[PDB]
Design a protein around this ligand. Structure first.
Ligand SMILES: *Cc1c(COP(=O)(O)O)cnc(C)c1O
Ligand SMILES: *Cc1c(COP(=O)(O)O)cnc(C)c1O
Ligand SMILES: [Zn+2]
Ligand SMILES: [Zn+2]
Lengths: 405, 137, 405, 135
C-alpha cells in the first residue's frame, strides 16, 4: 500500500524549516496541503487553456469547458452520485449548506416544523439553520450526545419527530473525531417525513463517500481540505429535490430565457451556478480527486486509523493530558494540557516547528458542552507519519516541564 | 479547406429549410443553445406514438438551423422510441464513435463532419435536444 | 514597458491554435494571466498555504498576512476609504446578489422602484427581478439613445422619489459605452435612492475611484483583470454595510455562537463566511500590482488606440455593422450581413482567432438592437494592431467563404 | 529561545496579577481575542482627565493575562493622552518598530519578546485594545 516517503515527496510545502526544525504540519483539519499534481493542474490551466466556459465557439473555450464539465464528472464518480445533474460547484461547504438553508429550508419550514442538528456541529452547519428557523417561525432542536461525544441512535429517534422537516449533521466531527452513523440517521429522518443534510467537509478527504448507499438528501464538502485548491466545494442534492428548489443566486449562466421582468432557469446542474464559475478551482479539485483515488481512500483511511491509534496510545502515557472524544475516530486528536492554556501549548509546538490549531475550531457550542474555553488539536492526513506524532508528544512533554519547573 | 465539413447538403438545408413554421394542437418545446444565439421553437403534432408532422421556427447559425430542418424531415412519420434511438445514435456520432448504422436515419449524416469543430456540437444537437424533452413524459 | 515586454509575461499567448498564432480577442469574456499572478498561486501552494485568521502557527500567520494584505491592495486600487468596505466574494455576480439579498429585500416595499437599463448584463438584471418579486416593488428601465448611450435626461425622467435603488453597469460589455456613473449617483441621491455599480467591465481597463464616483456599491471580478478565477470584490459604503444583514452564515463571520443565536464579526469579515478564497484573493492582489505597475491610464490609452484602429479598419470593410458609439472601451460588437456569428467565430478560430458569438449575457440588449446574435472582439493590454489586422483579414476570408455557396 | 518570550516578569504577572477585580461606578468594557481563549473585562474609573484606578477580570493564556496586569498597573495615575501614547508605543513594540523610549513602561517592556512570536500579538494587545475602546 502507501509508501509515505513517495507520498511526502509530492508535497513541496512539507520540505522546509520553521524555527530551525523540519515543519511538522498537524493542521490538516483546518486545511490540507497540495501535491504537485494539483498545483501543476492550476499552472497548466493558466498557461495553456484559460477561457470562459460553456458559451463559446473558440478552441481554448472548448478545452476550458471540457475541463470544467470533466471535473464535474470526476466529483460525481468520486461520491457515487447517480447523475451530473446532482453535482453543483460552490465556493465551499459553507456556501453549500447556505444554499440548502436559503433555497430548501425557507420553502419547506412553517411554524411547528423542526430543524434537528447536533451539539458537535461546525458553525457552518449551525448558523444557516438558526437563520432559516427565524425566517420561517420553525424551531431548532439539538440531538444530545453521549459521554464519549458520540451520538446514539436512540437519542436521534427521541429527538426526531413527525414535525421534523430537516436533520443536519456532520459526517465526521472536526473536534471529536467521531464518525456519525449517517446512514442510520438518514433512515430515521425519512421515517419521520424529513430530509437529511450531511456536512461532509471532514469525512470526504479521509474516507470513501457513497451518497447512494448513504441515501443522504444533501451532502456538502470543501476542496481545500482534500488536497484541492481553496475557494471551491460541492453541493450534492438528490435530483428530485434540486428540481423543485429555486436558485440561491441569479445572473448569467444560470438562465435560459431573460425577459425584462421574468426569466427562466437552465436545467440542472447549471440552474445553481450563477456567473463565471470557479473554473481553475473546479479543474484542480478534479485533479485532487484523481490523486486521492489513485492512492485509494480506503488506504488513506487505514493510514489515518493507524496514526490515530498510535497517537492515542502515546497520549495515554502522558499524564496531565485530556483527550476529548471516543476511541474509534478519524485522524485527529483534540486535547488540553492541565494547567497550561492552549495558546501557550501552540506557541511551544510552533517553536519546535509543529503546526496545530488552538481555540474553539468553529464549534463553540461543543466547547461549552465539554466545559472548556479552548482546546488544542492535532490532525493527520496521508502525508503524516508516526515520527511526527513522536515529535508532537515530545513537545507536549517539554511544554509540561517548561511551565511546571 | 478543412471548413468544407460544412457539406453541400447542409448548406442546402440552411438555404432552403424543410418544415418552417408553427403547428397547432401540438406538443410545443422551446429551446436555446447553451452556446448562446441559436433559438428553436419545435412543434410536433403526433398521431399517438408517431410524429405526423414536425415543424420548427428559429434563428441561428447554419448548423443549428440545418440540423433542425434535416431533423424535422427525417422525423416526419417516425415510429416508436426509435426516435430516441436516432437521438442516441446522433450523440454518439458527434463524439466520434461508430453506431448502429442504417435504421434509415434519413439524410443528415453530413453532420458527421462536426465530430471536428466540437464547439459546434451543441449547434447541431439543439434540435435533437428539443425532441428528447418533447417525449419527456 | 513596450507591448512586446507585456506579451512576454503571458505564457498562454505564445502558442499555436489550428496552425496559427493564437489571436486572443475575448478578454471581455475573460482575461489571461501574467507569470507574476500564476507564480503567486504557485508560491502560495508551495510555501505557506494554511488557514487564515484565528491562528497560531507560522504558516498560518504568512497566509493571513497575504489574504489581508490583498484586501488592502484592493482598497487602495479602487480608492475606498476603509478596509471595512472591501469584501472578497466569488465574483461580480455574487457581489450583485449580496446587494439584492441583504440590501434590496430590506429596503423595498410596494410602491418602491428599482431602476436599471436595457444594456445591463444578466448579473445586473436577474437579482433585481427577484428582489422586486419578493418585496412587491416595481422594476423600471431607463431607455437608451438610438446609438446605445444613456441620456442624463432619460435617467431624470425614469428616477422618481419612489426609487430606492438604481443599478447600472460602469461599462457595457456589448456596446463599449462608458456610462455617466458620477452624474447618475447624484440623480439617485437627489431622489432618496442608492446606486449600485456593476464595475466588472470597467475595473480591468480604467482607473476606479469609488470616492469620486460616490457610488454606494461597486462590484468587480478578478478573472477579467488578469486575476485568478473564482474571486471578486463587493465594495459598499461603510454606513450601508453596518446595517445590512450577512448574505451567508457560518464560521469566520461570527463573534459568538450559541445554540439558537449568534453575533456577527465587525466589517468586513461580517460578509465573509467559511474558509475564504485564500489563494485567489492573494493572486488578485498580485494582478493589481501588475496592472498598477503598467498603469491603468496607460492601459486605457492603449485600448482606445486599438479600438480607434479597429473601428477605422472596420467600416472600410463593406458589409459589417458595428453597434455602439465612436468613443468606446476596448471592444467591438458587430455582425457580418447574412452570416450568423457562430459561423464567423468558427472561421476566425480556424485562423486561430478567439471571439465571442451570441447575446454576451445581455438578451434584452439584443432585442433592443433587433438582432438574435452578435460577434464581439475585445482587446486588452497584450493585444496589438497586428492582431486587429489578422481579425479583419479573417473577416474578409469569412465573407468570401460564405459567398462561394 | 522560548526564554526570550516567557520572561520572569511575565510569568510573575501571570502567577500573581496586580489589579484583579471589576470595580464600581465606571466605564467597563469586555473584550475577546478572535483567536478564542482570551477574555478580559477591563474596569476604569476616570477622574476628569486621569485614570485614578484600573482593574481587570479574565481568563486566558500567560501573555494576555500578564499584559492585562502590567497594563492596568502602568496606567494608575497617568493621563488619558499619556495612556493612548503608551498604547501606540506598545503597538509599535509588537511590530518591528523603533518606538519612543521617552515615557517609562517599566515591566511592560518585558513583552518586547512577543514581537518574535506574532501569533501572540493579539494575546498581548487585548488588554490595550480594551483601553482604546474605553475612551
Ligand atoms: C463579466 C460581467 C459580469 C459578471 O461577472 P462574473 O465574473 O461572470 O460573475 C457582469 N456584468 C458585466 C458588465 C460583465 O462584463
Ligand atoms: C471545515 C469545515 C466546515 C466549513 O468548511 P469551509 O470549507 O471552511 O466552508 C464545515 N464543517 C466541517 C465539519 C468542517 O470541517
Ligand atoms: Zn450556432
Ligand atoms: Zn492568548
Amino acid at each position: 500500500h502507501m509508501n509515505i516517503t513517495d507520498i511526502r515527496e509530492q508535497f513541496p510545502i512539507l520540505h522546509q524549516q520553521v524555527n530551525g526544525h523540519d515543519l511538522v504540519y498537524l493542521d490538516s483539519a483546518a486545511t490540507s496541503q497540495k501535491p504537485r499534481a494539483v498545483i501543476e493542474t492550476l499552472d497548466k490551466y493558466y498557461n495553456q487553456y484559460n477561457s470562459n466556459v460553456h458559451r463559446g465557439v473558440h478552441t481554448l473555450g472548448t478545452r476550458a469547458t471540457d475541463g470544467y464539465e470533466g471535473a464535474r464528472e470526476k466529483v460525481r464518480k468520486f461520491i457515487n452520485a447517480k447523475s451530473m445533474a446532482e453535482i453543483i460547484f460552490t465556493k465551499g461547504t459553507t456556501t453549500s449548506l447556505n444554499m440548502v438553508a436559503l433555497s430548501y429550508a425557507r420553502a419547506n419550514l412553517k411554524p411547528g416544523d423542526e430543524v434537528v442538528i447536533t451539539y458537535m456541529e461546525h458553525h457552518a452547519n449551525i448558523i444557516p439553520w438558526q437563520q432559516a428557523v427565524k425566517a420561517t417561525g420553525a424551531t431548532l432542536k439539538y440531538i444530545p450526545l453521549q459521554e464519549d461525544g458520540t451520538i446514539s441512535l436512540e437519542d436521534v429517534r427521541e429527538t426526531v419527530t413527525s414535525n421534523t422537516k430537516i436533520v443536519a449533521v456532520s459526517h465526521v466531527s472536526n473536534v471529536l473525531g467521531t464518525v456519525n452513523p449517517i446512514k442510520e440517521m438518514a433512515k430515521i429522518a425519512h421515517d419521520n417525513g424529513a430530509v437529511i443534510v450531511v456536512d461532509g467537509a471532514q469525512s470526504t478527504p479521509h474516507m470513501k463517500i457513497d451518497v447512494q448507499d448513504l441515501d443522504c438528501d444533501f451532502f456538502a464538502l470543501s476542496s481545500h481540505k482534500m488536497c484541492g485548491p481553496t475557494g471551491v466545494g460541492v453541493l450534492y442534492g438528490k435530483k428530485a429535490l434540486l428540481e423543485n428548489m429555486e436558485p440561491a443566486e441569479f445572473g448569467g449562466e444560470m438562465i435560459d430565457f431573460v425577459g425584462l421582468y421574468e426569466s427562466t432557469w437552465k436545467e440542472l446542474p447549471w440552474k445553481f451556478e450563477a456567473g463565471t464559475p470557479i473554473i481553475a478551482g473546479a479543474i484542480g479539485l478534479g485533479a485532487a480527486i484523481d490523486f486521492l483515488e489513485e492512492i485509494g481512500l480506503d488506504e488513506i483511511s487505514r493510514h489515518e486509523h493507524k496514526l490515530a491509534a498510535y497517537a492515542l496510545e502515546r497520549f495515554r502515557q502522558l499524564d496531565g493530558v485530556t483527550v476529548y472524544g471516543p476511541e474509534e475516530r478519524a485522524g485527529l486528536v483534540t486535547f488540553n494540557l492541565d494547567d497550561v492554556h492552549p495558546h501557550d501549548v501552540a506557541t511551544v509546538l510552533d517553536a519546535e516547528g509543529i503546526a496545530v490549531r488552538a481555540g474553539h475550531h468553529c464549534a463553540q457550542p461543543l466547547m461549552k458542552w465539554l466545559d472548556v474555553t479552548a482546546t488544542a488539536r492535532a490532525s493527520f492526513y496521508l502525508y503524516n507519519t508516526e515520527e511526527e506524532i513522536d515529535k508532537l508528544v515530545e513537545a507536549l512533554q517539554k511544554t509540561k516541564e517548561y511551565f511546571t519547573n | 479547406n478543412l471548413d468544407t465539413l460544412y457539406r453541400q447538403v447542409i448548406m442546402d438545408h440552411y438555404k432552403n429549410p424543410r418544415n418552417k413554421g408553427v403547428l397547432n394542437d401540438s406538443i410545443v418545446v422551446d429551446m436555446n443553445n447553451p452556446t448562446c444565439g441559436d433559438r428553436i421553437r419545435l412543434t410536433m403534432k403526433l398521431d399517438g406514438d408517431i410524429v405526423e408532422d414536425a415543424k420548427f421556427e428559429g434563428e441561428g447559425c447554419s448548423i443549428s438551423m440545418a440540423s433542425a430542418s434535416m431533423m424535422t424531415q427525417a422525423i416526419k412519420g417516425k415510429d416508436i422510441e426509435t426516435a430516441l434511438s436516432m437521438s442516441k445514435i446522433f450523440s454518439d456520432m458527434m463524439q466520434g464513435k461508430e453506431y448502429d448504422d442504417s435504421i434509415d436515419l434519413g439524410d443528415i449524416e453530413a453532420l458527421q463532419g462536426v465530430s471536428k469543430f466540437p464547439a459546434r456540437i451543441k449547434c447541431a444537437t439543439l434540435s435533437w435536444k428539443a425532441l428528447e424533452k418533447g417525449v419527456a413524459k
